[PDB]
Design a binder for this molecule. Structure first.
Ligand SMILES: O=C(O)c1ccccc1C(=O)c1ccc(C(=O)O)c([N+](=O)[O-])c1
Ligand SMILES: O=C(O)c1ccccc1C(=O)c1ccc(C(=O)O)c([N+](=O)[O-])c1
Ligand SMILES: O=C(O)c1ccccc1C(=O)c1ccc(C(=O)O)c([N+](=O)[O-])c1
Ligand SMILES: O=C(O)c1ccccc1C(=O)c1ccc(C(=O)O)c([N+](=O)[O-])c1
Ligand SMILES: O=C(O)c1ccccc1C(=O)c1ccc(C(=O)O)c([N+](=O)[O-])c1
Ligand SMILES: O=C(O)c1ccccc1C(=O)c1ccc(C(=O)O)c([N+](=O)[O-])c1
Lengths: 151, 151, 151, 151, 151, 151
């Protein structure tokens, strides 16, 4: 009866994201990854799906419009997202307060695992496009598609 | 089957704390407030209890030793605490990472309601001891005991 | 003989902005709101004017070029702006130091009211464009024009 | 008719503090330095007085109890203080919001001059006690008393 | 046998940048300024060169691709860059951790001199384009080219 | 001819500290660990020594008085320390600027390895005293003495 939505662009999903999914899935009856660029929509979904097969209570959905409308429509009960820094917290803070104001929807933040603290979709992509190896920071389903898109 | 522990000294509990309790209680099957100074242990418990009677799935317990041992002993599944600022986040971040490392216990943070952003037990107490009125920032059960302790 | 300039794009002005105007107007003989996008220039001015009729010592002006040149030309004596977060402070800090260096013009910062901490023109607009209700965060003169522009 | 209180322990006053006093005195009809340890009360007052003789609209007073009660009793209209960092801002933010809540008293912050950014009474004292020369960071009236107290 | 690379766009180089170069050159056998817009490549190089003639162990090079590949190719041993704020630190932190992960290359940060804390290439340019005088914040070789480009 | 001092209380030294020592030793001809409580002086030295035998150009010394006097007396050329967060940076920033002002001594900061980001002597000790296992966060020479001191 509890449910969390983990929203993001996931372009592509990273091992930091999967860590958040696993931790959300352990505390909520259901988790919905809402995908809201380098990869098109279908690629993003497949990469998330392929990376979370070990999470039976998690489902992946494409989202549109406000996250809070997605949460309330799904009958979900909260938003969960990962935080790395105090500056992450301050921007996500404003968004969470706003979401609470407009829809009554709450947001729970989880601290990133230390080993993924410096990993983001954006930085991974910029490094990859310049010839660096980020394969230890991404799930293999992403690594596969990444190599192909840069081959 | 889900359970969150909200730990703190609660000396005294504030309306910011109660806001966190209510939001935890809405997402978890059970919430345990763990009380770990101006008020003695018994006063703190009573004040928390008196302020949370509208929360049927919440219980108040005195705690001792590491929070993570309390969580695992209670068969609880997570720690929940409130955050006001980016500097709060960085100190609580270190603690959460440490707790995750030593016990595998996860921590979910919730952004304070905007109207309670500047309220803390410490600041409330210092202002109260100097003759200021913080009654709109504390539950009435606390206000009652506070007036008595300063009368 | 004292005068503060409150500069910004005010696109649109928010209740957080009006709170700053009121607090500036209480401490300075004169306040000049300098307007420096969703709404054109004329709309922005009218919205500010319509929202500050209760402030007799405040005037609204369109500005061009550096804020400090506007301040010195108006014979004003300081810049006043609102701050919500430590990350706001660091960017505005650099600007204030720069303005002090180049023109000798000082900047006074005021902490946002807690209830408007998460409100900004940008976030209000993004939420509004996606169908969310931000009417409690904006003056009615803005709400009127906003509904019209989204109707 | 405008008036600012600049409160602090001023133990001892630094050139960063005097910079704030000068900037407050330029924008307000009156400035009251409220002194609220290494130096006793009388030394602190004299050092502030001796360092601000070039500020005719500034007076120095010993304060007791809440700053906001001092402000309202003096018929003053605002608190002014200096800020160096984003972490300064977050602690002073909580205090300013609290002061606004309890007494309606507003706080204006001013960014430190870059050359005094790293100067505080505490750090100056610790360095001085260990044999370092901080004379370029303090007014001469303080330097005089400091040498004597360490001779 | 020690060597530091100081990378950046240097568009244009500022006195804050030169301060970093001087401090790097004092601790490392060799310093390589790697230039990676208002000024074209050739102008940027000349401005850096013209501003560092007093630094015999420093050389200026145009760079391409990842900074860490430049470092390893030059047989250099570290990256050095200046930091002004805690928010600078958090973004540069992520980059440094990433660079360490992908290439084993370390990054040493140096705190800006207080008098250049508010100076950046970007802010200097925006102020200059609007008619402000930033000549005390830039080397004369830059000031010369700047006046010409705005004349 | 280059030399860095890594100062601290090292009570006890952690694997985060050793990571900093190794990275300093790779860039400087010589590294001096300056030890400036749970463990007495002799224990601290031995623990540092025992944990750095793989670093031939590093020596351990007890220090007294200002770090900058130690640096200049040793004919060393810089201070090196580790940073974990933006709030670490702001406090260490003030100290570095002060040290630069009083002695001309520069400070180079290094970002902690991600896996040791949450580790500090203080937090390790508090967790250890409460029965938690921090052995993966400390060198074995420290773990040995720690077990003994808690047995
Ligand atoms: O969609 C919203 O709810 C929303 C609300 C206020 C302001 C902007 C937005 C967005 O456009 C948005 C888009 C994607 C994401 C995401 O990460 O998928 C998020 N997000 O905050 O998580 C937000
Ligand atoms: O007890 C611990 O778990 C712990 C772990 C590492 C370091 C210090 C401690 C504490 O002494 C502590 C005491 C009270 C609280 C609380 O707020 O009740 C918390 N707390 O972090 O929530 C922590
Ligand atoms: O105009 C300046 O003074 C200035 C100076 C240095 C760098 C950029 C600028 C701007 O383009 C600017 C534009 C609008 C505003 C505003 O908010 O209206 C502000 N502002 O900082 O307040 C600044
Ligand atoms: O006195 C108060 O107003 C107050 C209010 C809430 C919490 C603590 C206090 C203090 O004990 C205090 C003492 C000295 C100063 C100062 O710097 O002189 C300040 N101060 O914040 O400026 C505050
Ligand atoms: O080039 C990289 O190494 C790199 C790595 C990861 C992500 C982005 C990049 C960049 O595009 C980049 C470009 C210029 C600079 C610079 O300032 O010259 C830097 N820089 O971080 O210093 C980085
Ligand atoms: O000793 C100084 O240089 C100093 C200067 C200004 C203010 C305080 C101090 C200290 O008491 C101090 C003590 C130990 C350490 C350390 O960590 O060993 C450091 N430290 O900053 O590294 C500083």
């Amino acid at each position: 009866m509890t449910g969390a939505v983990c929203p993001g662009s996931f372009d592509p999903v990273t091992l930091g994201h999967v860590d958040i999914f696993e931790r959300a899935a352990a505390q909520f009856d259901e988790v919905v990854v809402a995908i809201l660029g380098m990869f098109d929509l279908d690629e993003r979904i497949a990469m998330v799906k392929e990376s979370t097969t070990h999470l039976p209570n998690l489902r992946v959905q494409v989202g549109h419009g406000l996250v809070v409308d997605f949460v309330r429509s799904c009958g979900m009960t909260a938003i969960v997202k990962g935080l790395r820094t105090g500056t992450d917290f301050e921007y996500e803070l404003q968004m969470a307060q706003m979401n609470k104001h407009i829809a009554g929807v709450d947001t729970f933040f989880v601290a990133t695992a230390p080993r993924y603290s410096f990993v983001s979709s954006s930085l991974a992509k910029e490094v990859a496009m310049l010839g660096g190896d980020v394969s230890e920071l991404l799930p293999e389903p992403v690594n596969r598609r990444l190599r192909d898109r840069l081959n």
